[PDB]
Design a protein around this ligand. Sequence first.
Ligand SMILES: O=C(NO)[C@@H](O)[C@H](O)[C@H](O)COP(=O)(O)O
Ligand SMILES: O=C(NO)[C@@H](O)[C@H](O)[C@H](O)COP(=O)(O)O
Lengths: 556, 556
Amino acid sequence: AALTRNPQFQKLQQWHREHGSELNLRHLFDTDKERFNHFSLTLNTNHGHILLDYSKNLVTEEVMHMLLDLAKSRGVEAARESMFNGEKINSTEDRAVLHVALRNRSNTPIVVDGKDVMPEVNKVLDKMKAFCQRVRSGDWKGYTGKTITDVINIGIGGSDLGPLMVTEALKPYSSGGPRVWFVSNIDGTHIAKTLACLNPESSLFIIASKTFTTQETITNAKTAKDWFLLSAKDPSTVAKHFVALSTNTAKVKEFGIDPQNMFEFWDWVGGRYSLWSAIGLSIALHVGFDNFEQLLSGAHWMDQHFRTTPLEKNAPVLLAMLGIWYINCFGCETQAVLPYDQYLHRFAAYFQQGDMESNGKYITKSGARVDHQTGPIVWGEPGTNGQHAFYQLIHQGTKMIPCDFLIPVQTQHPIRKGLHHKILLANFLAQTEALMKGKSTEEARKELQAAGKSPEDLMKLLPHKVFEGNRPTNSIVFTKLTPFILGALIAMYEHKIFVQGVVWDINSFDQWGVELGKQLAKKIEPELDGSSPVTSHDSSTNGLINFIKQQREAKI
Amino acid sequence: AALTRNPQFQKLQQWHREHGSELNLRHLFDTDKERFNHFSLTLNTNHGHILLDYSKNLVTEEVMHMLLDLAKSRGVEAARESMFNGEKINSTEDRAVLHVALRNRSNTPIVVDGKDVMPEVNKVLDKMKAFCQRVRSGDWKGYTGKTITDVINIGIGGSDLGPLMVTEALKPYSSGGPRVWFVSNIDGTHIAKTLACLNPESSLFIIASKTFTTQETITNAKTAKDWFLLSAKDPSTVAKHFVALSTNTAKVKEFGIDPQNMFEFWDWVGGRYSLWSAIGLSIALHVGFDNFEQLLSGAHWMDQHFRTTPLEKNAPVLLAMLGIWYINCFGCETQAVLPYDQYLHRFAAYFQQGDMESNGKYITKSGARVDHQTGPIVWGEPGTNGQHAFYQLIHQGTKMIPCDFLIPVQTQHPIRKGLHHKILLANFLAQTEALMKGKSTEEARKELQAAGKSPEDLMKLLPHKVFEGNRPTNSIVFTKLTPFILGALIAMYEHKIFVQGVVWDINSFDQWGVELGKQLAKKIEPELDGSSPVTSHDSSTNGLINFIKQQREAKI
Ligand SMILES: O=C(NO)[C@@H](O)[C@H](O)[C@H](O)COP(=O)(O)O
Ligand SMILES: O=C(NO)[C@@H](O)[C@H](O)[C@H](O)COP(=O)(O)O
């Protein structure tokens, strides 16, 4: 594998196995009061500021220089240009990777197969804008002349999570927009519970699917249409209640959706990087097209930052290299994402997909099997809730867990004259301070003695109240969570994921395991029908299938 | 350190040290046709069956024997009886651990440092039922003589996640009950968007706090009362719209809720183990008291299973020891929980707290600092969705990740003649089969060769299409997800967590990390007031605070 054979990686590795064990955050701050200044980055987007404070990390100037030298020797910049220039860096599927083109507000030409893709990107965007206009203004009428009150997005994975997370994060900006619903799981409960609340006369279904063949989505789509026609009664009416977001005109046709009602994207648009495309139709319908264009602009701003800033001051690069540091040097399996914002309740989940589906690989672009760690397990929940739950393990467990704490300075709901947000911010700050500082044995025993504890009680309870600290965190603070800032934040992490993938020399844009999954259920599905036992698989699969058929009858 | 000194543990490590790496699942099955029958257990609860299939784990007869031997030399059984007998096993807090008492429907005596607790346990339960009957029937009236249509639960951590997860899971049994809402985050957005949909006249608030001093809960509670009074008046009417669940009678009164409307629990009721107590009121209110009793009955059955079953066939113990195996011998940092049920969308999140807040510790009950790993990081999202996302990493990443796949045989919504559930079951089965089997280079080669690829391209793509497999999983299948079964499943995991803690000799029932957090931001909160810079903390905390002050009034 490329990484292990790299001299910069070896130098960093040797340094860590020579000093790593010795790096204490509390000590570092106590010996360098310019630390914050030296390990923090402030970005002024002219539409809000974003402060990336990475000073609470187990690093020194020597460590950062070695990490950036690695980014350089691993060719991050050249790879970055290849992506922005439309080169087919997705080597296994031989495709370009152009989500940056989707939000290329500057309209600078990007050539693929001898053709600028921007004209087509803008054509779809204009079509989306015209459609949303019609729907929102009430011009688009259902089969009975009523305006559309509900929009239902049917899709899964990359055709679901992005729009779900963004519409949730941007709720404050959806005034004058129809209600938006997201159905994704094949589990019947999802679509059934959704349909139960809808009126077919005023509901518009959006079938999101790059391929338009995914089993969960097509099956949900058919159930929706069947449900609809139970009222409509004229397939000529579905044209007024069903539209498609896809790249496969053929399939959309077979389903019963004529063009003009198909908003397309392209193969260089990865599913987990597709919310910026026609896939974001539900977003635009929810918050309006101006806000949707703001989202795109925020992403474009971050793309430009990533492309023009020297590595040492490049946000996504710094985030990516600190991650490489914890993953490949400290051996940390996970990465926690902790937004202190309820609207971002699906943010961690979104990047759980974005990061893991991209870098959960073990084969390099040269075909060699990696002999080092790659993508981490990403998780988290919106604080503060976590503090009263899993934070216990982050503070006093046996695992090192790098955490990204995020929060907006200004809230969308300054109720009680800002009291709630004041408390939220204080907790945000105090948590990373405590993770860094911890609480020594002397400090703990002091409190216990002041509490008047007997020598007996203090002795047995003292160890349990000590916090070793030295747990690294990043604090990302932005002025306000607007469509623009959100877009820049999502783009920031997309590029962090990109940089790590380049350093590991893997292809962060294919998903063979996901592709495989879409073809596994195939064989067992028909075998579940009969009531006769199955014996064609290993004994576990057989036993589970037979327990299934047996309990199918059970009358509980 | 205590587990380190155990001979059974040493035996395990030595065996694995030179053998726990050759264990290949596919090989184990292709040499033992009775593997499924020998490595699985079927539990008939009389209200549905539960199949725990742990045959797809990297274990052999020998290994399970050694694992069970370790369980007994560490005193699991002794520790268990101590818990059920009311002994104060929560050493650091010298408190009993009796969530089992809450659902002890056999009413068998459990003397607690004096008198039997059941009489009081059943007293609250009766009071709870009485209250529910009044609210659901229409007896309990709003100050304007209106019937309750919305119930809002306000609490955080253990006073929030349990009732939220259960009411979501048992939604199909909520016919007739009012709508339930859960507010927990101090983030003003949470209470704001919740109250914006309510009508003060027909809304009843439940303030859930064991101590009734938690800043988040108390503050949200005060804000709720405020919202209510600017639509009515006379702080007396509050009595008709606010009730409390706590152990602190007095401080609950100085708020505005007479002890009349207070449903108490006790100190031996851990927050993360409290949904079975008064904390579960929102559950009883949503699905009725008969269903709530079914839930308790379910947990009670599992408790008896755990208490009377020989270790070799004990569900919670088997799950626990398999976990110890992966954590302490294979070094796996995480445990994934993948329910194939939309209703269980908050299930993984529930145990993320239950497990991590319990076993995320590093100090033994003897005061010694652990010499090994403890509590893993728990995470997950419902199936099939994850298959289109993070499963990529489970299948082809560089981390070993034990996964628990769960699914009900019978769906609550058999739409399209069961087509959706048939597809859901097929994926459930196919995914674990695939994680175990993988796809060899040879198999992938033959598929690509047939596909028409040339030596050039086939070679280029081949390694990327190979699945090493040997990914261990547990498949837990139950007849139907009913109140009773949900109760049994939750109790099963509580005991799994209990067993692991004992083996590690830690205290799974205190939370000094969580206790520290509920006092961390207090020093920073006041410093946020004003526009003057702070210099009292480390440069990072100072820097963040100053950036917030500067941006708080920046007009974007
Ligand atoms: O590629 C992926 N993620 O990046 C996957 O998550 C796809 O987005 C998901 O399987 C949906 O595929 P279709 O849009 O073709 O229905
Ligand atoms: O102990 C805990 N979990 O087990 C914590 O998660 C508590 O449940 C949470 O802090 C709420 O405490 P109060 O009910 O006193 O408001």
